[PDB]
């Protein structure tokens, strides 16, 4: 564990991250898709062999010794409110498992199902309260990456409101 688990944001790639493991916005075919997706598929490409799961669940596949953990967010333009709600908390209880599993002291991860899959919606506040809901009981160091400069404050925020 960390000797004193916290949260950050930083505004940058992923593909950059200082940390012991990736989380991928995945897609449930392994392909190397778009956005988070095509950056992690650059950096770790062998991480997508038989990366392929289901909506709703997090596969890891080693980089080397480098852990990817391929977690599938919901497409809120194929499901309603309600299911896609229920699958996009179910993939972060799913990496919260596999950050344990693998023993990490960190982890970078992004908000799922907020780009391509939000079905045009703003759900930083979904996303990142059902990413806080799955990773409050563990004790890995999360940085969370975003690209745009009002998401960072607008998640900054919401960390520092619980410390
Ligand atoms: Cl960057
Ligand atoms: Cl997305
Ligand atoms: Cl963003």
């Given at each position: 564990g960390a000797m004193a688990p916290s949260y950050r944001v930083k505004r940058m790639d992923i593909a950059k991250n200082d940390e012991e493991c990736v989380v991928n916005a995945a897609n449930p075919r392994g392909?190397?898709?778009?956005?988070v997706c095509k950056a992690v598929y650059k950096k770790?490409?062998?991480?997508?062999?038989?990366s392929a799961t289901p909506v709703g669940t997090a596969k890891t596949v080693m980089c080397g010794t480098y852990p990817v953990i391929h977690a599938v967010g919901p497409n809120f333009s194929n499901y309603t409110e309600s299911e896609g709600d229920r699958e996009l908390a179910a993939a972060y209880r799913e990496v919260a498992k596999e950050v344990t599993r693998l023993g990490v002291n960190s982890v970078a991860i992004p908000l799922l199902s907020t780009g391509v899959y939000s079905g045009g919606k703003d759900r930083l506040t979904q996303s990142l309260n059902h990413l806080f809901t799955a990773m409050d009981s563990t004790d890995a160091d999360v940085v969370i990456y975003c690209r745009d400069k009002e998401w960072e404050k607008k998640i900054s925020e919401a960390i520092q409101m619980r410390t």
């Open positions: 392909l190397p898709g778009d956005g770790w490409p062998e991480s997508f062999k038989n």
